[PDB]
Design a binder for this molecule. Structure first.
Ligand SMILES: [Mg+2]
Ligand SMILES: [Mg+2]
Ligand SMILES: [Mg+2]
Ligand SMILES: [Mg+2]
Ligand SMILES: [Mg+2]
Ligand SMILES: [Mg+2]
Ligand SMILES: [Mg+2]
Ligand SMILES: [Mg+2]
Ligand SMILES: [Mg+2]
Ligand SMILES: [Mg+2]
Ligand SMILES: [Mg+2]
Ligand SMILES: [Mg+2]
Ligand SMILES: [Mg+2]
Ligand SMILES: [Mg+2]
Ligand SMILES: [Mg+2]
Ligand SMILES: [Mg+2]
Ligand SMILES: [Mg+2]
Ligand SMILES: [Mg+2]
Ligand SMILES: [Mg+2]
Ligand SMILES: [Mg+2]
Ligand SMILES: [Mg+2]
Ligand SMILES: [Mg+2]
Ligand SMILES: [Mg+2]
Ligand SMILES: [Mg+2]
Ligand SMILES: [Mg+2]
Ligand SMILES: [Mg+2]
Ligand SMILES: [Mg+2]
Ligand SMILES: [Mg+2]
Ligand SMILES: [Mg+2]
Ligand SMILES: [Mg+2]
Ligand SMILES: [Mg+2]
Ligand SMILES: [Mg+2]
Ligand SMILES: [Mg+2]
Ligand SMILES: [Mg+2]
Ligand SMILES: [Mg+2]
Ligand SMILES: [Mg+2]
Ligand SMILES: [Mg+2]
Ligand SMILES: [Mg+2]
Ligand SMILES: [Mg+2]
Ligand SMILES: [Mg+2]
Ligand SMILES: [Mg+2]
Ligand SMILES: [Mg+2]
Ligand SMILES: [Zn+2]
Lengths: 169, 109, 112, 213, 117, 51
RNA sequence: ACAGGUUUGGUCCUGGCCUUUCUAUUAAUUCUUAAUAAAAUUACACAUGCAAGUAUCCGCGCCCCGGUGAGAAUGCCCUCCAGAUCUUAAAGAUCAAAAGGAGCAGGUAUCAAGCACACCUAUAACGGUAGCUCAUAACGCCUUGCUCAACCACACCCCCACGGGAAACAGCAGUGAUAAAAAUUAAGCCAUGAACGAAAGUUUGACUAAGUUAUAUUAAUUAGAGUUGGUAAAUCUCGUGCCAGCCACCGCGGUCAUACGAUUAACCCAAAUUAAUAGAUCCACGGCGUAAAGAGUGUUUAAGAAAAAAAAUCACAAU
RNA sequence: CCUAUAUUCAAUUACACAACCAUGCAAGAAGAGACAAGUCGUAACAAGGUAAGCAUACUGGAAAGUGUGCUUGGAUUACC
């Protein structure tokens, strides 16, 4: 787009390139940050940039931002078990915040790979049906098998009218 | 129009197509109620063959009879289409030639 | 351990709107929703009813809510779990000291 | 589902109560319900015709309550059998009548509901079960001087094999399954038949409510 | 859709082309239409012979045995196909049909011999 | 393990924060020292003017 | 959109309409055979035929399949599942009502207030609080099936179905009325799905094999339709002369027509060619001094940005 | 109630009941457009011959005229 300070962050590619996936126990991320002082430049840049990337890959996690109540910027992760994860961000940078969050509460590369390997199993290559869920519609189009009657007409010996005609006489 | 205003108003959607004199039907079956002559607009002068019919929907509207020469009288069943005549204001219907009582144009013999 | 709720909001955070109801708090949770056209995240508000047995929530509190295993009524399905930030009286979780906005009421560099 | 504008339908629930009351008040008594026209083999109540394979038996035999109306205590402890059992099964199969409730609406008293103890093929059941297919025209009664002689049954063990070979592909599946883990045993795998025992079609079923445990 | 009852059945759904059948071996509810909603697809069945001349049939044996242990009923042609595959014992209907075919060949050769002299 | 690591990280950052805040307090004391010596000058001049 | 035609003596800019592309119906002209897919006017009323049977009686199924889109902004996706069915000793598997919600969801704010839509007590009764929703669209009005391995709703109507109108094809075929809309009142369970029976086996207007239809793609046994002023490929000769008439927009008709009617010739499609109506697509991440737009002014609620650092207050006619 | 079961009742009662609307017709009234015969003036475009226009008030067959504030979307041609 054109409107906005950074039009790039409002694109599907930017939202998809941010790889931060929370665990199933993660429910709430409450970020508290200030709008003044040189200490909180990293927290402000984190709120400006990385919140959309985290939100895109965690749609069910509620993220709430708060401004100018606590003098120290921090994050509070509310889990399913009730444990509150307190993350102090005073001089951390924008990339350091993301790396710290992924370290403390996130999903490993192998964990993501096993989920996607399970997901690709649902679509099965040998199944038949519509093009949305299956690769083949009718089994005629397979090379070695009988062609589709709407493309190559079948011989008179395989048509049902000739079989009825021969039985009639 | 700031981003907040665009989000508040939503994306623009194209309005639905307004129905024409035929109320969305390609053709309408009618009975001729008065055959007469109407004049064109200012830039060009003629004497067009116009008719007044009763459409199957119960609406009474004016139509135009294309072609040179016709034999249409009272209580005659014809079919009209959404042909708009540019020279005649308010006439948005044209009688289909080659119908029950409005047949094809005859050649001068 | 048969204690489950049918609502998706297992745990939510919101601001207290009104406390006119007796032992019942009216909270507003703000979530981030993506606009399919602008591709931008906007704050969508939703009102929730919560049970405050002790009646301590005032107007302006940041409140955590846990999904109630059984709904007491057809509109109350949550309970007040903890108050995160009391209005006007904020305690910094990282330092444990009272703060007034961006200013420290009690400096942590003076233990005694 | 659940909307804000859901109308509180009352006639739909009133009809449930009306039909519930009419089901019990106008309950068709089993006498006229199971009444039978012996000329057309046409049920006057339901409107169904009898199967053609049951045409001889209706005119040539009798039902349970048709023979039970001539007993003093409505057949307490008596043995009753079926002619179909007499034909198909050479082993004694009988019903020990423990209680009978005949209908009072029948003006010949040949209809009712009876319970008892079932002993099929000599195997005795230690539980009380309801007697099925009472209206069938196949029942026969045994006399008192044959009550003891009919019970004479010899207990012969079955010769059914307890294990069978697996189908070819399925058997090869296990032979490949254990070989991958490294089981060098070449023992022939069997399929058990201990729990595969099933009752024949002539075995009647219980008509009591099943208790969910 | 909502049903009052019914049972899970592994059957064949005729999804194909005119004068060119093709069955999908699928596990579906008993009260649903033949080509309607199903639970999980298992395999394919090709009624016509191909260029090489084999009748090609697919079985997803693992899911089939899983569902059958779960309580899936079976249809008669599915039983014939499974018996031919070797996963299940041969259906007696095939055996009696083979014996009937044997008797038809015997009577055919008898009549052919008697009609020639 | 991760949550103990987070607790240790937070305590470390709190220690650096206290170290910074003490220096900030010293600088604030210097600011008080300058403002007091100024307000002594402007306060006395107004008193002399009004006297 | 790779655009083009079109405002003006003329140029630039702004701005609307139309053309160029694809699909579906009806109408006109023409038409030869096959294959495949689909058969689409009606929730107006139906003559007649068939469509639920199975079985040693009991019983089991009997809008299940199939048909339709009237109502509902209905609904899409997601948790919990009562209950029903298959087999078991339990447990498991399918359908899954009711209750909801993280989220999404037609137009209309000239629909801005709705009018009882809320909470605690301990018991399932008394009472006390003054509440609840809503401009992030509540409460209202209108329209419509749909986000499709599918899903939702209906079965003559009274939303229901005790009862009242009253004798029911929104099953397969067919008949009246209506409409621009036009399939056989035909054969079978051989193969699938369903129902029954332990079973050989029976039924199934579902389904299969067919009959009819240029509604559409392919092969060919077939050649007709449209157009020839610009957009936009292509006209020679006659007749009329602002008359007859033609056009999607500009527009053409002068005893002066490559635009009207006919002939020749030519161009593009092709068993199809045009006309009409519907669609897909098409408005603004663009502007607001002169073309439509900065609302007569200030403060404030809700809401939003505080992204690096600074400041506040002085002659003169505020009120 | 020496084996165990049968029957019954679920119908009424008090009030507004076409108000509110939707679709056509209607004695009639008014408006807008196209304005193929026209009649009456010349309001605006040139300091359009009284400079135009805005708000408002009054008056007049009519375009319009005038009063009070406001604008240049008019000039005062510029050592005058
Ligand atoms: Mg036209
Ligand atoms: Mg014709
Ligand atoms: Mg029956
Ligand atoms: Mg077909
Ligand atoms: Mg102009
Ligand atoms: Mg047609
Ligand atoms: Mg349907
Ligand atoms: Mg409605
Ligand atoms: Mg359940
Ligand atoms: Mg459910
Ligand atoms: Mg209005
Ligand atoms: Mg509708
Ligand atoms: Mg009904
Ligand atoms: Mg009907
Ligand atoms: Mg019906
Ligand atoms: Mg029909
Ligand atoms: Mg008809
Ligand atoms: Mg048609
Ligand atoms: Mg016809
Ligand atoms: Mg016809
Ligand atoms: Mg037939
Ligand atoms: Mg069949
Ligand atoms: Mg059969
Ligand atoms: Mg075609
Ligand atoms: Mg000429
Ligand atoms: Mg022409
Ligand atoms: Mg042309
Ligand atoms: Mg011409
Ligand atoms: Mg524009
Ligand atoms: Mg303007
Ligand atoms: Mg202004
Ligand atoms: Mg104004
Ligand atoms: Mg004037
Ligand atoms: Mg002058
Ligand atoms: Mg003048
Ligand atoms: Mg004058
Ligand atoms: Mg003047
Ligand atoms: Mg002037
Ligand atoms: Mg004025
Ligand atoms: Mg005057
Ligand atoms: Mg005067
Ligand atoms: Mg001027
Ligand atoms: Zn095919």
């Amino acid at each position: 787009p054109m409107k906005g300070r950074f039009p790039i962050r409002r694109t599907l590619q930017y939202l998809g390139q941010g790889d931060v996936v929370f665990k199933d126990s993660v429910k709430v991320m409450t970020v508290n940050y200030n709008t003044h002082g040189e200490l909180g430049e990293g927290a402000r840049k984190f709120v400006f940039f990385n919140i959309p990337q985290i939100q895109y890959k965690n749609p069910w996690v509620q993220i709430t931002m708060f401004k100018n109540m606590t003098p120290s910027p921090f994050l509070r992760f509310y889990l399913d078990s009730g444990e509150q994860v307190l993350v102090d961000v005073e001089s951390k940078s924008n990339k350091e915040i993301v790396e710290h969050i992924r370290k403390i509460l996130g999903k490993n590369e192998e964990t993501l790979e096993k989920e996607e390997q399970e997901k690709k199993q649902l679509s099965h290559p040998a199944h038949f049906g519509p093009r949305k869920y299956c690769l083949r519609e009718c089994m005629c189009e397979v090379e070695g098998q009988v062609p589709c009657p709407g493309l190559v007409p079948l011989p008179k010996e395989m048509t049902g009218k000739y079989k009825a005609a021969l039985k009639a006489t | 129009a700031t981003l907040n205003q665009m989000h508040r108003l939503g994306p623009p959607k194209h309005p639905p197509g307004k129905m024409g004199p035929t109320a969305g039907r390609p053709q309408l079956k009618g009975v001729v109620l008065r055959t007469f002559i109407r004049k064109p607009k200012k830039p060009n002068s003629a004497n067009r063959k116009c008719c007044r019919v009763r459409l199957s929907t119960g609406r009474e509207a004016v139509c135009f009879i294309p072609g040179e020469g016709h034999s249409l009288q009272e209580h005659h069943v014809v079919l009209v289409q959404g042909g708009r005549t540019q020279d005649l204001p308010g006439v948005k219907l044209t009688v289909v030639r080659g119908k029950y009582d409005c047949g094809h144009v005859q050649k001068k013999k | 351990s048969i204690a489950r709720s049918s609502v998706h909001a297992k745990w939510v955070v919101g601001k207290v709107i009104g406390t006119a109801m007796q032992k019942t708090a009216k909270v507003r949770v703000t979530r981030l929703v993506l606009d399919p056209y602008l591709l931008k995240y906007f704050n969508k508000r939703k009102t929730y009813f919560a049970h405050d047995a002790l009646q301590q929530c005032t107007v302006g509190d940041i409140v955590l809510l846990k999904a109630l295993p059984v709904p007491r009524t057809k509109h109350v399905k949550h309970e007040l779990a903890e108050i995160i930030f009391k209005v006007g009286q904020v305690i910094d979780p990282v330092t444990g000291k009272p703060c007034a906005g961006t200013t420290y009421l009690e400096s942590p560099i003076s233990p005694e | 589902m659940a909307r804000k504008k859901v109308r509180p339908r009352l006639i739909a629930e009133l009809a449930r109560r009306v039909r519930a009351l009419r089901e019990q008040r106008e309950r068709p008594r089993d006498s006229q319900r199971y009444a039978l026209d012996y000329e057309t083999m046409m049920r006057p109540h339901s409107g169904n015709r009898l199967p053609m394979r049951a045409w001889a038996d209706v005119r040539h035999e009798s039902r349970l309550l048709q023979l039970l109306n001539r007993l003093p205590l409505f057949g307490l402890g008596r043995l009753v059998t079926r002619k179909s059992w007499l034909w198909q099964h050479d082993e004694p199969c009988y019903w020990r009548l423990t209680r009978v409730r005949p209908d009072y609406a029948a003006e010949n008293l040949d209809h009712g509901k009876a319970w008892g103890i079932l002993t099929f093929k000599g195997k005795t059941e230690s539980e009380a079960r309801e007697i099925e297919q009472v209206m069938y025209h196949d029942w026969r009664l045994v006399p008192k001087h044959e009550e003891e002689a009919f019970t004479a049954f010899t207990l012969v063990p079955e010769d059914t094999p307890l294990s069978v070979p697996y189908p070819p592909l399925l058997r090869a599946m296990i032979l490949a399954q254990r070989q991958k883990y490294g089981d060098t045993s070449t023992e022939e795998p069997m399929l058990n038949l201990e729990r595969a025992r099933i009752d024949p079609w002539d075995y009647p079923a219980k008509l009591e409510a099943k208790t969910k445990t | 859709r909502a049903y009052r009852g019914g049972h899970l059945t592994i059957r064949l759904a005729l999804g194909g082309c005119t004068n060119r059948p093709f069955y999908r071996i699928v596990a579906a509810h008993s009260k649903c239409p033949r080509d309607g909603r199903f639970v999980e697809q298992l395999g394919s069945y090709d009624p016509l012979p191909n260029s090489h001349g084999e009748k090609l049939v697919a079985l997803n044996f693992d899911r089939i045995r899983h569902w059958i242990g779960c309580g899936a009923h079976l249809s008669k042609p599915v039983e014939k196909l499974l018996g031919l595959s070797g996963f299940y014992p041969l259906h007696p209907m095939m055996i009696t049909n083979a014996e009937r075919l044997r008797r038809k060949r015997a009577r055919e050769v008898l009549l052919a011999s008697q009609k020639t002299d | 393990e991760l949550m103990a690591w987070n607790q240790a990280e937070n305590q470390r950052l709190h220690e650096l924060r206290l170290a910074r805040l003490r220096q900030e307090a010293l600088e604030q004391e210097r600011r008080q020292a300058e403002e007091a010596v100024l307000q002594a000058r402007e306060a006395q001049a107004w008193a002399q003017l009004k006297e």
